[PDB]
Amino acid sequence: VPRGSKTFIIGISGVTNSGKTTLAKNLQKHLPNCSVISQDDFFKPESEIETDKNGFLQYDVLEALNMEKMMSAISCWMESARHSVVSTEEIPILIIEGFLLFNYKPLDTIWNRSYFLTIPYEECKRRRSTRVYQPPDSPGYFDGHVWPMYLKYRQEMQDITWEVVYLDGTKSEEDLFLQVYEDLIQEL
Ligand X SMILES: NC(=O)c1ccc[n+]([C@@H]2O[C@H](COP(=O)(O)O)[C@@H](O)[C@H]2O)c1
Annotation: binding site for ATP: 14-22, 127, 131-133, 171-173
Q: Is 40 a catalytic residue?
A: yes
Could you say which of 68, 108, 156, 183 contacts Cl ion (CB under 5 A)? Answer: 68
- Give least dist CB 75 to Cl ion, A: 14
Measured CA distances, 8 to 12, 17, 28 (Å) = 13, 25, 13
Task: Determine if 133 is a binding residue for ligand X (CB under 6 A).
Answer: yes
Sheet holding 8-14, edge to edge: 34-38, 93-97, 8-14, 113-118, 165-168
Task: Determine if 40 is a binding residue for ligand X (CB under 6 A).
Answer: yes
Q: How far apart are CA 160 and CA 74, in angstroms?
A: 21
- Give least dist CB 39 to Cl ion, A: 12
- Which of ligand X, Cl ion, none is residue 73 near (CB under 5 to 8 Å by kind)? none
Bridge partners (DSSP) listed for residue 34? 93
Q: How far apart are CA 6 and CA 26, in angstroms?
A: 23
Task: Determine if 59 is a binding residue for ligand X (CB under 6 A).
Answer: yes
Could you say which of 10, 16, 77, 142 contacts ligand X (CB under 6 A)? Answer: 16
Residues identified as active-site = 40
